[PDB]
Write an enzyme that holds these catalytic residues in place. Sequence first.
Site, PDB file in Angstrom:
ATOM      1  N   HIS A 201       0.860  -1.180   0.000  1.00 17.34           N
ATOM      2  CA  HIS A 201       0.000   0.000   0.000  1.00 17.34           C
ATOM      3  C   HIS A 201       0.896   1.229   0.000  1.00 17.34           C
ATOM      4  O   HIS A 201       1.577   1.504   0.997  1.00 17.34           O
ATOM      5  CB  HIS A 201      -0.953   0.027   1.195  1.00 17.34           C
ATOM      6  CG  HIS A 201      -1.867   1.213   1.197  1.00 17.34           C
ATOM      7  ND1 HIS A 201      -3.176   1.146   0.771  1.00 17.34           N
ATOM      8  CD2 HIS A 201      -1.654   2.501   1.556  1.00 17.34           C
ATOM      9  CE1 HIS A 201      -3.731   2.341   0.872  1.00 17.34           C
ATOM     10  NE2 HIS A 201      -2.829   3.181   1.346  1.00 17.34           N
ATOM     11  N   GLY A 202       0.902   1.959  -1.113  1.00 17.31           N
ATOM     12  CA  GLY A 202       1.629   3.206  -1.211  1.00 17.31           C
ATOM     13  C   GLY A 202       0.706   4.390  -0.986  1.00 17.31           C
ATOM     14  O   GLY A 202      -0.497   4.317  -1.232  1.00 17.31           O
ATOM     15  N   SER A 203       1.285   5.487  -0.506  1.00 19.20           N
ATOM     16  CA  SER A 203       0.522   6.694  -0.226  1.00 19.20           C
ATOM     17  C   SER A 203       1.484   7.868  -0.147  1.00 19.20           C
ATOM     18  O   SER A 203       2.693   7.692   0.033  1.00 19.20           O
ATOM     19  CB  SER A 203      -0.279   6.565   1.074  1.00 19.20           C
ATOM     20  OG  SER A 203      -1.329   7.515   1.121  1.00 19.20           O
ATOM     21  N   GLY A 210      -0.987  10.239   9.774  1.00 18.03           N
ATOM     22  CA  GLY A 210      -2.338   9.787  10.051  1.00 18.03           C
ATOM     23  C   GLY A 210      -2.492   8.286   9.902  1.00 18.03           C
ATOM     24  O   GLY A 210      -3.250   7.657  10.646  1.00 18.03           O
ATOM     25  N   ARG A 217      -7.934   3.408   6.740  1.00 20.56           N
ATOM     26  CA  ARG A 217      -9.334   3.570   7.097  1.00 20.56           C
ATOM     27  C   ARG A 217     -10.187   3.599   5.841  1.00 20.56           C
ATOM     28  O   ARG A 217      -9.699   3.848   4.739  1.00 20.56           O
ATOM     29  CB  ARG A 217      -9.554   4.854   7.897  1.00 20.56           C
ATOM     30  CG  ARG A 217      -9.179   4.736   9.353  1.00 20.56           C
ATOM     31  CD  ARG A 217      -8.434   5.982   9.765  1.00 20.56           C
ATOM     32  NE  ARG A 217      -7.224   6.134   8.969  1.00 20.56           N
ATOM     33  CZ  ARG A 217      -6.947   7.194   8.221  1.00 20.56           C
ATOM     34  NH1 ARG A 217      -7.771   8.226   8.151  1.00 20.56           N
ATOM     35  NH2 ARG A 217      -5.819   7.216   7.520  1.00 20.56           N
ATOM     36  N   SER A 243       1.631   0.156  -6.385  1.00 28.02           N
ATOM     37  CA  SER A 243       1.458   0.919  -5.155  1.00 28.02           C
ATOM     38  C   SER A 243       2.436   2.084  -5.077  1.00 28.02           C
ATOM     39  O   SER A 243       2.118   3.118  -4.479  1.00 28.02           O
ATOM     40  CB  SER A 243       1.630   0.004  -3.942  1.00 28.02           C
ATOM     41  OG  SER A 243       0.515  -0.853  -3.778  1.00 28.02           O
ATOM     42  N   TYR A 246       1.182   5.397  -6.341  1.00 24.37           N
ATOM     43  CA  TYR A 246       0.320   6.151  -5.442  1.00 24.37           C
ATOM     44  C   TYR A 246       1.094   6.934  -4.390  1.00 24.37           C
ATOM     45  O   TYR A 246       0.477   7.677  -3.619  1.00 24.37           O
ATOM     46  CB  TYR A 246      -0.674   5.212  -4.762  1.00 24.37           C
ATOM     47  CG  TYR A 246      -1.716   4.679  -5.709  1.00 24.37           C
ATOM     48  CD1 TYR A 246      -2.790   5.466  -6.101  1.00 24.37           C
ATOM     49  CD2 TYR A 246      -1.622   3.393  -6.222  1.00 24.37           C
ATOM     50  CE1 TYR A 246      -3.742   4.987  -6.971  1.00 24.37           C
ATOM     51  CE2 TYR A 246      -2.573   2.905  -7.093  1.00 24.37           C
ATOM     52  CZ  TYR A 246      -3.632   3.705  -7.462  1.00 24.37           C
ATOM     53  OH  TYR A 246      -4.585   3.225  -8.330  1.00 24.37           O
ATOM     54  N   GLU A 327      -5.643  -5.823  -8.062  1.00 27.58           N
ATOM     55  CA  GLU A 327      -6.002  -4.994  -6.925  1.00 27.58           C
ATOM     56  C   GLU A 327      -6.700  -5.864  -5.893  1.00 27.58           C
ATOM     57  O   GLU A 327      -7.379  -6.834  -6.237  1.00 27.58           O
ATOM     58  CB  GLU A 327      -6.918  -3.825  -7.320  1.00 27.58           C
ATOM     59  CG  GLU A 327      -6.192  -2.524  -7.622  1.00 27.58           C
ATOM     60  CD  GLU A 327      -7.082  -1.489  -8.295  1.00 27.58           C
ATOM     61  OE1 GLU A 327      -8.208  -1.262  -7.800  1.00 27.58           O
ATOM     62  OE2 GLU A 327      -6.643  -0.869  -9.286  1.00 27.58           O
TER      63      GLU A 327
HETATM   64  C1  LIG Z   1      -4.639   7.566   3.083  1.00 24.76           C
HETATM   65  C2  LIG Z   1      -5.879   8.425   3.326  1.00 24.76           C
HETATM   66  C3  LIG Z   1      -7.095   7.610   3.817  1.00 24.76           C
HETATM   67  C4  LIG Z   1      -8.390   8.420   3.955  1.00 24.76           C
HETATM   68  C5  LIG Z   1      -9.501   7.664   4.674  1.00 24.76           C
HETATM   69  N1  LIG Z   1      -7.350   6.380   3.024  1.00 24.76           N
HETATM   70  C6  LIG Z   1      -7.744   6.597   1.631  1.00 24.76           C
HETATM   71  C7  LIG Z   1      -8.503   5.408   1.092  1.00 24.76           C
HETATM   72  N2  LIG Z   1      -7.767   4.169   1.325  1.00 24.76           N
HETATM   73  C8  LIG Z   1      -7.397   3.330   0.333  1.00 24.76           C
HETATM   74  O1  LIG Z   1      -6.778   2.300   0.586  1.00 24.76           O
HETATM   75  C9  LIG Z   1      -7.675   3.625  -1.116  1.00 24.76           C
HETATM   76  C10 LIG Z   1      -6.606   3.763  -1.993  1.00 24.76           C
HETATM   77  C11 LIG Z   1      -6.798   4.026  -3.345  1.00 24.76           C
HETATM   78  C12 LIG Z   1      -5.591   4.176  -4.244  1.00 24.76           C
HETATM   79  N3  LIG Z   1      -4.448   3.331  -3.885  1.00 24.76           N
HETATM   80  C13 LIG Z   1      -3.495   3.864  -3.047  1.00 24.76           C
HETATM   81  O2  LIG Z   1      -3.554   4.991  -2.583  1.00 24.76           O
HETATM   82  N4  LIG Z   1      -2.431   3.039  -2.736  1.00 24.76           N
HETATM   83  C14 LIG Z   1      -2.203   1.750  -3.164  1.00 24.76           C
HETATM   84  O3  LIG Z   1      -1.205   1.131  -2.805  1.00 24.76           O
HETATM   85  C15 LIG Z   1      -3.238   1.228  -4.054  1.00 24.76           C
HETATM   86  C16 LIG Z   1      -3.117  -0.071  -4.554  1.00 24.76           C
HETATM   87  C17 LIG Z   1      -4.084  -0.584  -5.397  1.00 24.76           C
HETATM   88  C18 LIG Z   1      -5.176   0.216  -5.736  1.00 24.76           C
HETATM   89  C19 LIG Z   1      -5.314   1.508  -5.251  1.00 24.76           C
HETATM   90  C20 LIG Z   1      -4.338   2.032  -4.396  1.00 24.76           C
HETATM   91  C21 LIG Z   1      -8.099   4.148  -3.830  1.00 24.76           C
HETATM   92  C22 LIG Z   1      -9.186   4.007  -2.976  1.00 24.76           C
HETATM   93  C23 LIG Z   1      -8.960   3.743  -1.638  1.00 24.76           C
HETATM   94  F1  LIG Z   1     -10.023   3.606  -0.825  1.00 24.76           F
HETATM   95  C24 LIG Z   1      -7.504   3.923   2.726  1.00 24.76           C
HETATM   96  C25 LIG Z   1      -7.226   5.162   3.573  1.00 24.76           C
HETATM   97  O4  LIG Z   1      -6.895   4.988   4.748  1.00 24.76           O
END
Ligand SMILES: CCC(CC)N1CCN(C(=O)c2cc(Cn3c(=O)[nH]c(=O)c4ccccc43)ccc2F)CC1=O
Length: 350
Positions: A201-203, A210, A217, A243, A246, A327
């Site tokens: 999971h990348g962000s 957070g 979440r 990931s 992202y 995914e």
């Molecule tokens: C971080 C802020 C909070 C806010 C509540 N949040 C945001 C929602 N979310 C998600 O997992 C989420 C991620 C993506 C996009 N996407 C990503 O970002 N990374 C990945 O590796 C990834 C891998 C495969 C597909 C999509 C990916 C789309 C929709 C989602 F719901 C959990 C969360 O906690």
Amino acid sequence: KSKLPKPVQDLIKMIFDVESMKKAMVEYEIDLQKMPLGKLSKRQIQAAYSILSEVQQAVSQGSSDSQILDLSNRFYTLIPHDFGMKKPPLLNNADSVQAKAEMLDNLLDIEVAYSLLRGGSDDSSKDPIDVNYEKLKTDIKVVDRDSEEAEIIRKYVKNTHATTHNAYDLEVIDIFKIEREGECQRYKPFKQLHNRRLLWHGSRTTNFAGILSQGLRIAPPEAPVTGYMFGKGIYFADMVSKSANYCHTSQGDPIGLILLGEVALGNMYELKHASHISKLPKGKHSVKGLGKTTPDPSANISLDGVDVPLGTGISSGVNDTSLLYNEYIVYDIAQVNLKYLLKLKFNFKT
Ligand SMILES: CCC(CC)N1CCN(C(=O)c2cc(Cn3c(=O)[nH]c(=O)c4ccccc43)ccc2F)CC1=O
């Protein structure tokens, strides 16, 4: 003066940096003068989510396109932007709604980080690195570079970088072992579910104060379910480069953060195209988006009793799919147990 390991100190400094938070908001072209980081509020973000939901409902329920125009302008009044001389993107199609939903997701965790920073107790005899570390309620340890953990993780990174994601090379800087407080107890009802997989999971870096504080979440109830391809859940991938995209790193900020989480997938409802759901039918525990390329299954390794799909990319043989790569989505936050946090350098090819 902090006794913490230097890599952990660098991590704390990175994820709590206030100027990185402002740069992220400016990257979204939010007007910092009219809406500074200190005025950003949770209920304001939730109200912006509800406008997107109103747009979602107005589009599908056949309302006037004129109302959609007004809802779009209302969004840009609630969240002040500054596009200079350009026309702000109009909020009338799913494409624009999903981009704004992504933006609000990022603002939500930025608000969590800044509120974490400005809250709690403060003591001038304490290193701010020590204070901010304790605010995360997360035990963070550096994984030994020569350990077998790091070997498997580096192999995972090495083998699952998609050829299509050719814009950069990845280099592991630090591997952290993380334990969020309470998350292991919350994961216990899913510990013995079948099909447990170690997934990426990348962000954005500005989300990780957070994420470590609150975990991954599901988007709040006000968020539009159609704003996300497979609805409102927690998304993972088995290709590190999927990931890694992202992380939204650039040549200006080429350091990314990526999570390895133990995800209890159970029975996977396998899908090839978008399906905007918030819950699953009984007997299904996750969605698997079917990609055209998958890690070779004959190369799966076990790490602490969890499958690690570190095989090289091969054709999945899956016919008509809108997904290049797999995914995985869960719709219950207790199905996730974060295990590792990686610090990666993106070496962009030129
Ligand atoms: C971080 C802020 C909070 C806010 C509540 N949040 C945001 C929602 N979310 C998600 O997992 C989420 C991620 C993506 C996009 N996407 C990503 O970002 N990374 C990945 O590796 C990834 C891998 C495969 C597909 C999509 C990916 C789309 C929709 C989602 F719901 C959990 C969360 O906690």
